[PDB]
Design a protein around this ligand. Sequence first.
Ligand SMILES: CCCCC/C=C\C/C=C\CCCCCCCC(=O)O
Lengths: 49, 49
Amino acid sequence: TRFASVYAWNRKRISNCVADYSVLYNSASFSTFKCYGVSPTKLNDLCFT
Amino acid sequence: NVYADSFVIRGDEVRQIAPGQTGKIADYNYKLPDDFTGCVIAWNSNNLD
Ligand SMILES: CCCCC/C=C\C/C=C\CCCCCCCC(=O)O
């Protein structure tokens, strides 16, 4: 509902779940989306630490 | 061997028209090859559509 300020930004941990971003295809559209150490087309076959 | 392909999408999905992209349009609607040779053109059409 409400986000944090840039100078006092927030940080929360994600663990013990399944990353399936297809559920965002009908609710949210993103103007910017860039990844750095991995390819966007390989995210479905990986695990994250 | 020249071909010209045309369609209409929304504004923030224009970034998905690239060889190695993921998302709603790059997955189920229109995909480009990795060894692509060509040019990609877009422009706003809020007056017409
Ligand atoms: C808050 C949950 C975090 C998700 C779990 C962590 C990493 C999963 C791997 C990559 C992040 C998915 C990006 C989702 C946005 C892309 C949507 C799109 O395709 O346009």
